Design a protein around this ligand. Structure first.
Ligand SMILES: Cc1cccc(O)c1
Ligand SMILES: Cc1cccc(O)c1
Ligand SMILES: Cc1cccc(O)c1
Ligand SMILES: Cc1cccc(O)c1
Ligand SMILES: Cc1cccc(O)c1
Ligand SMILES: Cc1cccc(O)c1
Ligand SMILES: [Cl-]
Ligand SMILES: [Cl-]
Ligand SMILES: [Zn+2]
Ligand SMILES: [Zn+2]
Lengths: 21, 30, 29, 21, 29, 30, 21, 21, 29, 21, 30, 21
């Protein structure tokens, strides 16, 4: 999930955009 | 864009601003 | 535009707190 | 929705919870 | 409602910074 | 409501939103 | 105090409400 | 109060300090 | 005053995110 | 500038990036 | 004023409010 | 820089003001 991907690890913008509708 | 741990409320704000008019889903922990 | 955009930012931060692990959808179009 | 309900007048935490999940 | 409510959110965050360990009361009714 | 460390400015925002019209007192460290 | 209760440990909503006026 | 003083016009950090404590 | 001041706060937080290590200037007078 | 462009209407992250650096 | 680590977005907000009409420059990491 | 001074160490207000224009 977003927390495990972007909070516990660091995310790219592209990786963050996976969580848009 | 930053290279940082986005956690809690920063993660949601960053989503908000990244997704613009699409909006988003925030599952929190999975 | 901005005023509802600025409101939106505060709503999502509020949602984060109130909803917790439940999370939430943020959308309307 | 949440924007028309909660940007016109103040939504308490109780009101905002309606939009969870 | 909201505009003064949205302002309030920013005031309290400002207060947190400026006041530090002194803290502050936030009220008016 | 979250199960998280609310610290600094997040603690005060969470107060703000929890207490609504009552308002609050923030002592910071005691 | 609130910091020792909700920042260094985790707080419930009810525990947070102790700090309202 | 703070809301009528600081939401109508901008309160600097100096002005906001009045409301500390 | 406040409304553009409240906007400003959100702009700078947005800038922080979008700009990253590049950083940014915030000014206009 | 950014304030007149981005406080009147919404600036996306793409628009805000113009002001980086 | 606080005695705290001001990091990320808190650092920039604190700048914003400290500098008022002067504005500021945020280099991020140097 | 500001991060090394105020994030990794703690800053005074005066120290923070070094980063105003
Ligand atoms: C209310 C609304 C409209 C469009 C996009 C959103 O994320 C929210
Ligand atoms: C918590 C919150 C944010 C924005 C608008 C509201 O009505 C309530
Ligand atoms: C100005 C004001 C009114 C009511 C409640 C508050 O917390 C603040
Ligand atoms: C710092 C701050 C927040 C909100 C209103 C103000 O006048 C000042
Ligand atoms: C991200 C952001 C903040 C404030 C105004 C805007 O147009 C965009
Ligand atoms: C747009 C503007 C005017 C004055 C000071 C600032 O930091 C920004
Ligand atoms: Cl606002
Ligand atoms: Cl943090
Ligand atoms: Zn705001
Ligand atoms: Zn934070």
């Amino acid at each position: 999930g977003i927390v495990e991907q972007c909070c516990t690890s660091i995310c790219s913008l592209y990786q963050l955009e996976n969580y848009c509708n | 864009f930053v290279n940082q741990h986005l956690c809690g409320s920063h993660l949601v704000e960053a989503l908000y601003l990244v997704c613009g008019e699409r909006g988003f889903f925030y599952t929190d922990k999975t």
